[PDB]
Symmetry: C3
Subunit: 119 residues, 3 copies
């Protein structure tokens, strides 16, 4: 019935996206490209775009975002990219905290909750 789960980008460890009754949970997305906070933030947001598309959602349908930075010194730099990317008038619940990530060179990780668009 309506609690049925769908899985996207499944690995032995995690799925990139998981969806159930209209809600969408993305794995924490980490940089695949870039060195600077801005470069890495851009790459992470592009991944999010790609995975939200796969789930029948998009950034204008993000409910919540938690942003983990390795170093809170990168706040303004991250924000500059985030601010340009978010859907205006439809910006999500957000929290930003300092936490070290699985690799030392990762400066940002963003964890998204979103909703599947109604047809």
């Amino acid at each position: 019935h309506h609690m049925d789960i769908r899985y996207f980008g499944t690995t032995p460890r995690y799925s990139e996206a998981v969806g159930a009754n209209g809600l969408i949970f993305l794995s924490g997305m980490v940089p695949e490209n870039g060195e600077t906070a801005a470069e890495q933030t851009a790459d992470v947001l592009a991944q999010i775009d790609r995975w939200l598309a796969e789930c029948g959602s998009d950034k204008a349908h993000v409910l919540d975002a938690v942003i983990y930075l390795r170093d809170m010194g990168d706040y303004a730099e991250m924000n500059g990219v985030w601010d340009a990317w978010v859907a205006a008038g439809r910006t999500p619940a957000r929290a930003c905290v300092e936490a070290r990530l699985a690799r030392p060179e990762w400066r940002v990780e963003i964890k998204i909750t979103a909703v599947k668009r109604d047809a």
Copy 2:
């Protein structure tokens, strides 16, 4: 069915976001106070404000994530928290140590709630 309402929207985030009975609040950070207890009170008072605005309250919080700058403030935060929570209807909770956007912020609380029917 999956329609979204945004509350207190800024260019960067909204304070509250509702979809299909669920409410997601932004991390609420202190606007008043210096000590962990004073800041926890202020954070919780904001949560109350945004909850009420969204047709919810503290007795309909599902989940709370508490970030402290310093886990040494654990007892101090809890004292304020324990007094505030709706008795018999206390949420899923996790409390972890993480630094916040401003150095003087000792506490940030992130809430998921339900809109009362």
Copy 3:
């Protein structure tokens, strides 16, 4: 009554599990047994199994998991336990970040969101 809340393992501070409209929110599960990351992860995951079962769910119906490690040096050791525990083909959205926990001896805390299986 569509959004009725059910509470499980309610203390004056928190409930171990909270359910509403099919979704399950577990409190951060912390180790009650074990010293090493491996030992503590298993204990944490054993708790999760228990509470998910109490809420009419299981590990194959976990939507999301946030894993906090005291020390990111424990990443491989935790993943070892995680990888064997997770339901193959049904692995959840995951994020792993470094954060100190309530007690210094605690090396892992896992926070789960899941769905109540249909009848």
